């Protein structure tokens, strides 16, 4: 149609808690805006430690209060996703560390490596692991998210 592809990658180290929040605050946001057909959206765990769980319970409340329902199971990052990927956004340093160990592991890293936090206009540069927190601590970062997301979507680093 001559009538009117971009590429994301959310991470933590379990892909249960931050990640898969980040990944549906930002399909929504671009689901909302019409251009979800333009971009590409996923999360994914550094460690195997949960492949094939769905979204801690927490979280998915967190997400059901707000509106934004969370449909993905739990996978662990492959060498294709740096080849594949444009962003790949994570949480916090040791999430930062592990992906660039792994980055020097592939032939082809298309990817922007970063913390999803590098983004916040807050200035909140960690989103921490609500693992043993609480609902505060995950209303807490799903706001980073939204924040980081929108940011991100206004305008890529
Ligand atoms: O999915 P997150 O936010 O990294 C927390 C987590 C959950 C399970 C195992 C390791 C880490």
Redesign the pocket.
């Given at each position: 149609h001559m009538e009117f592809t971009k590429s994301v990658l959310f991470v933590?180290?379990?892909?249960?808690?931050?990640?898969?929040i980040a990944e549906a605050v930002f399909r929504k946001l671009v689901t909302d805006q019409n251009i979800s057909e333009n971009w590409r959206v996923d999360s994914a765990?550094t460690?195997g430690?949960?492949i094939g769980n769905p979204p801690?319970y927490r979280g998915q409340s967190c997400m059901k209060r707000h509106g934004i329902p969370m449909s993905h199971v739990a996978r662990q990052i492959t060498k294709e996703d740096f080849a594949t990927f444009d962003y790949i956004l994570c949480?916090?340093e040791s999430?930062l560390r592990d992906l660039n160990r792994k980055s020097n592991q592939v032939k082809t890293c298309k990817a922007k490596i970063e913390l999803l936090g590098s983004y916040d206009p807050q200035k909140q540069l960690i989103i921490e692991?609500?693992?043993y927190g609480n609902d505060s601590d995950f209303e807490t970062v799903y706001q980073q998210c939204v924040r980081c997301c929108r940011a991100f979507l206004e305008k890529a680093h």
């Amino acid at each position: 149609h001559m009538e009117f592809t971009k590429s994301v990658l959310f991470v933590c180290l379990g892909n249960i808690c931050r990640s898969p929040i980040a990944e549906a605050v930002f399909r929504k946001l671009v689901t909302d805006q019409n251009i979800s057909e333009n971009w590409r959206v996923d999360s994914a765990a550094t460690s195997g430690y949960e492949i094939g769980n769905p979204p801690d319970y927490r979280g998915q409340s967190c997400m059901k209060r707000h509106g934004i329902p969370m449909s993905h199971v739990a996978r662990q990052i492959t060498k294709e996703d740096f080849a594949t990927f444009d962003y790949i956004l994570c949480m916090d340093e040791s999430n930062l560390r592990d992906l660039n160990r792994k980055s020097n592991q592939v032939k082809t890293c298309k990817a922007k490596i970063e913390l999803l936090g590098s983004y916040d206009p807050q200035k909140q540069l960690i989103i921490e692991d609500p693992y043993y927190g609480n609902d505060s601590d995950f209303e807490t970062v799903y706001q980073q998210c939204v924040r980081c997301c929108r940011a991100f979507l206004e305008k890529a680093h």
